[PDB]
Symmetry: D2
Amino acid sequence: YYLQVRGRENFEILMKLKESLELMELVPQPLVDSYRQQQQLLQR
Amino acid sequence: DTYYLQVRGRENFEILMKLKESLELMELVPQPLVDSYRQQQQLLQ
Amino acid sequence: EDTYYLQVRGRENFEILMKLKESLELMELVPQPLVDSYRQQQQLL
Amino acid sequence: TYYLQVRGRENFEILMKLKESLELMELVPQPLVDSYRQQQQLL
C-alpha cells in the first residue's frame, strides 16, 4: 500500500514506524511470544 | 512539502494511516492549546 | 475516554511514542468541521 | 524504562502495537536489518 503525508518530521516518524512494523516480522515467534508474556506483567 | 511512503501488510497500512491522520490533524490545533496541553502532561508523566 | 498506562524501554522509543500519544490526544481538540474538510481532502489526495 | 499515560482504548492499542514493533526491532540481527534496508533501496 502507498501513503502520502504532509510534513518532513511526520514523514520521518512514519518511516521509522513502517520499518519497525516490517522488521519485527523477522523476529522468531518464540521471542515475540516471550516479549508479549513480559507485557502482561507491565500493562493491563 | 508532501512525502510518499510504501508499506507491506494491510494491518501495517491501517495503523500507519491512523497515525498519519493524527499527525496531520494535530497541525490544525491552534498553538495555544498545544502549549497548555503539554504543560499539563508534565504532572502525568 | 479511559486512562491507560504503558511502559517503554529506550529513550528514543519513548520519545517517538510520546509524539504519537500527543498527536492522538490533540486531534480531539480540532473542531469537527476542520476534521471533515481534512477527510474530504484526503479522499482526493 | 519510561512510562506514559494515554486517554482512550483505541489509542492505547495503537501505541501498544508500535511499542511492540519498536522494542522487538532491536532483536533483529544487524546484518538482517542492513539487508532489509538494502532491499528498500534496491527495490
